[PDB]
Amino acid sequence: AAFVEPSRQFVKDSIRLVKRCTKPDRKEFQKIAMATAIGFAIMGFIGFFVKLIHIPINN
Template sequence: MIFDLNSFIQQSARVLNVTHKPKQEEFKKMALVTALGIAIVGIIGFTISTIFALLR
C-alpha cells in the first residue's frame, strides 16, 4: 500500500478546518463526564478487588 502524502495533507487540512476550540460550558461538561467515567471504573475495580480479598 503506497502512502499518498498529498491526500493525507488535504484530509488533515479538512479536519482542522472543521474542528473548533470548545466553549467553557462544553469543556466543563466533557471534563465532568470524563471524571465520572474514571470514578465509575475505579469504583468497579475497587469493588472487585475487595470481593476477591474477602474471598481469600
C-alpha cells in the same frame, strides 16, 4: 519526479478537516471532563472496593 500526489494531498486535505471542525472550548470541556471522570470513578470506586472485598475471602 515529484509524482507523489496523495501524501501532499492527504496533508492538504486533513488540514481542511480540522479547520471546519468545531473545537470543544472551555464550557464544553468541563461538561465532558466530569462525565469521563464520574464514569471513571464509577468503575474506579465500585470496582476497586469490590476488588478489596475478595482479597481476604479467598485467603
